[PDB]
Design a protein around this ligand. Structure first.
Ligand SMILES: [Mn+2]
Ligand SMILES: [Mn+2]
Ligand SMILES: [Zn+2]
Ligand SMILES: [Zn+2]
Lengths: 294, 294
């Protein structure tokens, strides 16, 4: 039994400029589809789907438009994140859910660890408890592949992979956040029926001991998604810690896995500020500066 | 030949996204170098050179930094245009060149007709007289070739063609505004030494009979520099009109060539608003929308 009655599949799309990783991503699409656990039903009549107007980079680069297929008129016409995120909160209450008895599900750590946290620094919104614990479905998927036996996967995204492996047709268009959500809900549902144990497996914590030793800087990092990741890790206050299925307990919402304080008192402030990175303004980190991490 | 005692070579560099013409260019570099007409001397010691921080698109596009060579750091520490423009105005005063007896010199109509006009709208500043009267050096150059003997030119930018024609070494790097300035300055000097009459040949006007005809809309304009130009001509209030060297009189300064009101009056609102373009709603013009052209 998965211990949540209802699972919320979330995906964002953001602003980007492909060849440049020192980029202050802003949310441009915010999508959710609800999943009924005891009933095993994807409920796509219980949705959230909004576009979002960025403030830092108002014009979407052509390559971003290409990736996401989101046309510029759709963002010009949208509200800013603070407004949209507010609508989100109202919509949540609409669902009459029991605090801590529902979890978000994403295709990776990107959506909540990186995207949501950063956007929320910008919009100056404290990160809520239900974003500080979630189900990284792809990680679960790695385990399911061990159990059920490896397979040759030519697909190129986390979703693509899971759809290929589970032998599921692609829903709609890649990188539309809602379409991404629909693929993940289907994947999740097939996963549960094939025997996957689905719980919270990632927690956002204020502190990790691998951040005490300054990071081995790598000059060409703004051209590598991996290496950018490593610096994203140092800059963002909250870092992803993992947790074994059998170790998770419902009542961990919403206390910090490291410092055990409440999530209205933890992460108002970086606990391992990477001063070592911020000391040479011959090569400064752009996304850290506009966000105001220094 | 030159009725001015001082010539200010001016070049701008802007934000951009190569493949997309429907882009709200903001000034990121502002460069000027003075040329002392009577002594025929370039004056690098009398120059202005500021980077400028954009507000609509704050993170330079990778191809933008590739094109211009401006690193993101130079703009994150820079001032916003409104501030820099005020510095410019101050600089002018302290050099105490008498308005009406200097003129700006550019490599094309781009700097003042497009770039300056648009940015001034963004920054909500009335177009000054000295931007409404200028020397398009390239225009003089095509007449000079006509007078002396055309030759085969392989270079693609205007500065490139002029350097190649007058057989001059490229100064610095292309698309650094200040370097562009130094090139233009050397081209001008040579032009003059070869007997060219260098005087204002382009004026910004409120109105033009050719704009009375609605523009035959090319649906793929956003990916063609030339067809974008057409759109840009209909949106921006002021239009380029040319004037023969024989006709220009110094006291045209501050007086609109078309309507004859003073430029305190002429300019404040669009005389030929392109309403025909602005009705298609599943295909809106982004740069117009963002600047408040509608
Ligand atoms: Mn997605
Ligand atoms: Mn230039
Ligand atoms: Zn904590
Ligand atoms: Zn006029």
């Amino acid at each position: 039994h998965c211990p949540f009655d209802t699972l919320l599949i979330l995906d964002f799309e953001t602003t980007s400029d492909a060849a440049n990783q020192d980029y202050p991503c802003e949310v441009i699409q915010f999508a959710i589809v609800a999943y009924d656990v005891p009933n095993d039903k994807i409920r796509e009549d219980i949705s959230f789907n909004k576009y979002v107007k960025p403030v830092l980079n108002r014009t979407l680069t052509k390559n971003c438009v290409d990736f996401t297929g989101i046309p510029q008129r759709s963002i010009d016409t949208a509200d800013t994140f603070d407004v949209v995120y507010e609508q989100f909160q109202q919509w949540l209450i609409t669902l009459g859910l029991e605090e801590g008895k529902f979890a978000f599900v994403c295709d990776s750590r990107q959506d909540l660890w990186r995207i949501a946290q950063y956007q929320m620094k910008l919009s100056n919104i404290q990160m809520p408890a239900f974003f500080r614990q979630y189900i990284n479905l792809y990680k679960i998927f790695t385990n399911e592949m061990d159990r059920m036996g490896p397979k040759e996967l030519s697909a190129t995204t986390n979703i693509g992979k899971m759809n290929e492996y589970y032998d599921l047709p692609t829903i709609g268009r890649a990188h539309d956040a809602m379409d991404d959500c629909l693929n993940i809900a289907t994947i999740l549902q097939r996963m549960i029926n094939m025997g996957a144990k689905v719980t919270v497996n990632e927690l956002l914590t204020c502190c990790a001991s691998w951040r005490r030793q300054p990071l081995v800087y790598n000059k060409e990092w703004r051209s590598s998604f991996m290496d950018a990741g490593k610096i994203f890790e140092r800059v963002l206050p909250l870092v992803v810690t993992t947790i074994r299925a059998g170790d998770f307990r419902l009542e961990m919402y919403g206390v910090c896995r490291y410092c055990r304080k409440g999530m209205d008192v933890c992460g108002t402030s970086h606990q391992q500020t990477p001063h070592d990175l911020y000391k040479n303004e011959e090569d400064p980190i752009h996304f850290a500066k506009i966000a105001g991490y220094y």
